[PDB]
Assembly symmetry: D3
Homo-oligomer: 242 residues x 6
């Protein structure tokens, strides 16, 4: 009746079938306060589970922590409780020069540089969002006033070598990832983040709806964004309740 990690029950969600899933537990309260009567439900480790109401419908806000592994946990347990739509909000780093800090990235597809996506569908299966969620997100983003890019997102199990950072303890990137950033760029990939591949694959392959939206905070080639980011997702969420 009560899930293993989130420590909540189905009655707790008051029939919520949509969750906004940031990674940061501190984003959780703040997102809920762009909605109504935010109720604390549980807080175990990186998962802080809040209920709130949005346009007179119950919705979940659940932090996921960092990485596909912690994410796959939150999504599975919430789905056990009836949740069917999962909205990913956060911030990202752009790798295309034409993309500016302030812009929103809505993922049309994730490059699968993770491990947990593989635990749901084999590698040939695409990491793709639900079209309705991506649509709602694009719309909500455009209406916000921001410049908006639809495109492919590289989703990496690491922050440093998998995103080809050299400014690290050993200054070394494993062979697979050497020259990788330039490869994604010439392939038109827009950004690097760390959760969308597991999110989109586990959802696309398990009859769940998911999408990813994110604000550009750094550009490896070249606040208002963070605030307009959760603003954009709460509105994307609104659009999704039809």
């Amino acid at each position: 009746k009560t899930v293993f990690h989130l420590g909540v029950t189905e009655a707790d969600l008051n029939g919520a079938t949509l969750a906004i899933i940031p990674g940061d537990p501190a984003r959780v309260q703040k997102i809920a306060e762009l909605m109504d009567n935010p109720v604390f439900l549980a807080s175990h480790r990186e998962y802080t589970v809040y209920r709130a109401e949005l346009d007179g419908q119950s919705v979940v806000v659940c932090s996921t922590g960092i990485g596909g592994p912690s994410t796959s946990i939150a999504v599975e347990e919430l789905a056990q409780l009836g949740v069917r739509t999962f909205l990913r909000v956060g911030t990202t780093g752009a790798i295309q020069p034409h993309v500016n800090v302030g812009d929103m990235i809505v993922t049309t597809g994730s490059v699968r540089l993770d491990g947990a996506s593989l635990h749901f569908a084999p590698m040939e299966f695409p990491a793709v969002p639900d079209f309705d969620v991506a649509t709602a997100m694009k719309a909500a983003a455009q209406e916000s006033g921001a410049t908006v890019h639809m495109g492919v997102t590289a989703s990496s199990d690491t922050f440093y070598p998998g995103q080809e950072r050299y400014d690290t303890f050993t200054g070394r990137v494993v062979r697979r990832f050497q020259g990788s950033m330039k490869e994604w760029q010439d392939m038109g990939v827009l950004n690097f983040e760390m959760e969308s591949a597991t999110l989109l694959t586990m959802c696309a392959s398990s009859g769940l709806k998911a999408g990813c939206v994110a604000g550009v905070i750094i550009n490896r080639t070249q606040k208002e964004t963070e605030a307009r980011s959760i603003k954009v997702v709460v509105e994307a969420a609104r659009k999704m309740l039809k």
Copy 2:
């Protein structure tokens, strides 16, 4: 002079930046005839080529033949002649019982059960269409009055074992594909075809816009209406093309 396979020049396209790419050459004339001023350009192997006009703009219509390799050739040479947008069109068989014959499947992503996609991007790259193209296609498809499904398509390099068919010469399916049909169905995969993985990956990784839409003519949850769904299918890809052009 001309591109190596298609046998057309950039002059023949008359400034076309959008191509419609049906699989079978026999349908090329039908599609071009839904537009303004059809003209036959050439026929070489499985590449039958026509030029037409849509709202005052040139449009190429070009068959691809079957499978990722001949598709990869058409799309490459087309791109050399200035095409930047590709709308794939055809008829398909669904594998999800809730999908009726007559409906339109607009592919949001493809399972890469091909070889040619790996020649453009490693297996981790998503085989996804351009958002604008999938958006026009869904718009066009709904406009035609049919029910529309956006979802995943399994793109195989073979018609038989890769689509786990046992009624064959050997009766045999290689380990990789035994149980695969039920695996895809459980994963929500909508249908099978054989060029979308190669198309979507080559274009997504090369600065090109691509999309697929198909009419369901049969359900593997086992037709008569083949002619009609086809007609509806190419009307939709011509309307999607118009939306993409303006």
Copy 3:
């Protein structure tokens, strides 16, 4: 028994057990005209099927279109209708400086740079031709007055990046195939083409006998530019060779 794609029946074949399978439909007519009383059986998509008699014996000639996916459908449906032997003929580009435009290459194994071969057997399985088809083919090739090479062919699902061509729209090649031409060269690979890996693997793993012979129409290593005389000559040669190979295979 009308097969799904080729749309012919076993009757249509008259007991034919051997097929010659070019890629181009246009070449099916000419291979036929090297044999007797050509019978158009069907034509759907890139698949053009013809019965013809060679040495008083019924033999199919079937176009396969470009690529393993297209080829596997054609071989599968032929095989459902009694064909046990298949001879691939075509053109190829050589990557060894000692191989001249106009020579004949008979494939002894293919590098599997394709996807359809995997739908019949795992990568560890060798894409190898039937020993008798390769023997007959080499013999036919010598007898026709051409220089003949036996060896490994790299068989690619693409004509462009998988054969490391940079003269393309993007002008770039994915990591896997970056530097790959020089690697095949250093390994003794003779040439590139697009269908041998799927054919050989599927046939070798399915109790079908098969082989591939191609005429060299370009050498990426030779600065020389060939002509149209020897071009037309060695394509006429190749299909003339593939018919003498088939004859040797019949008895």
Copy 4:
């Protein structure tokens, strides 16, 4: 200019070159408060950081959050601030019958069911603890009076399908992991966890010392839920072992 995620500087570590890295942030204070002069340093996200002293040497305790990605970040950033030794403590579920609740598992190697390890070394590289750290944990564990097992831990990027759980929303396990648990049992594997393949591989291939010890609180081969005073006892003991093990690693 603190590290991006962790929110600490090298001066806050006070010259510490050893870290205890539990998964749960709620445990960091408890671990620190077994040492001398524990101070709260920072808490961002799932990263809760404390400092303490052990026998006259500064020690850091930093939580990692669930999974390889979250762990790799903590480890990388801890190393940038000078940490060269990483000791993982936690509780776990053993998949072998002969392994009992309250026992200690000390990992000598990890099956790599993660993705983050691959970002440091290719799959061929073993996910191996530092011999001195694993030696130090075996000694600490034994002296605690508990039964100790040295063996293989299966380390999965998921808690459900990748540990072959069927009690889930879809009830589905992907082919790769169907039958996998019996495979691991047959191969002598002691337990599932979710962070050891990444940590071990990252450290082994990066000039850092790491090892893993966990307390067995439940056995999946056994129906029962164990005594819930054994829960806290095993838990209390688990951190008493890694603190003693850490003291051994110093000196």
Copy 5:
């Protein structure tokens, strides 16, 4: 410098450009005995080397030992010493019921169930004999009187699980190889052995000629040991003769 494992010099070979490479060091002397002027050269580990002559020309017989790594070493070092052509000979157990005891199999290609081949060429590359060697081997086998099969050989890094043997210490076979024998059986694979994938791939990818011929002494699905052995080595020496003239 001089060859590290083999313990012979290029001079010791007296210009030999062809080697006959058996697995068992015990068969080296007897292969060499069928040829003119047999001479013991060296014995280090699994590597027993002899020289002999075939119609005026020097030949080496060098045992390889068991498995691809041992074989990769011998071939490489013989290659350093001037060898260009390698004829593998031996005995085998068929897995096709239609292949009878005393028949000869000539490998036209190997399934790469090995690791060492990957040290010479990616998996996509075919483990395939030289056409000339396989043709000479066919002809020598045919001329012997034995029924001759040209086909695919499965080449395994293990004798036990990778050939799907369950009569073992664990009784257990890893997933990749569960049901694998039937699969090879269905695909037409003629037999199992343990060195050909490594030999064929490293030769085919390094400008060396090579082939494999083997006598069928037993069938998995179902005197002769002495007899098939003799026929097998007479076959390879005749093959070696054809290759030199």
Copy 6:
């Protein structure tokens, strides 16, 4: 009532032996068993020389494995069928770290699986690691001999040449996979190259058998002493003794 296929021995012949020392060279077997009591020739077929000896009153096996995981996995499988449960690899090796000197001892705590045969026992993800007691016992025997001792990762290769990135060979070619590879393993702290540990360790750890590897440094590519060869088998014999108590 049963003789193993390759080794040609029975469980009776082992006299209750549950421990084997397993070097490469059969010539080392007689060397190793000379450090022990009442050596007994059990068999020799191909590259497998099998000796029973008594060590500190207990029955113990010494068995050569030849070169490579394939040959080695057969030896281990068949000894395991005969009750052997603990395996001690001894050998020579070549370091790739400058601080490691000729004459040092390396105890393998993990192997990079650059082999094929490991895969026949467990998927690639499974760690090729030694039993802890054996590694510990070996470290102990190594330090007690006076020599300098390193614990760490070993790169374990199905080839002597291209998979250890040697270019001093017939072709001078190294396949892409192993191009740049020595520098990669050097950067990852890898200690040494050899050719059997991955197969041995993976097969044993996945089959409920205990094993470990100790080797004497005879070369450093970034920079044989008979003393260090003798050191090596004395340590392994002494490691065995600590394993028997």
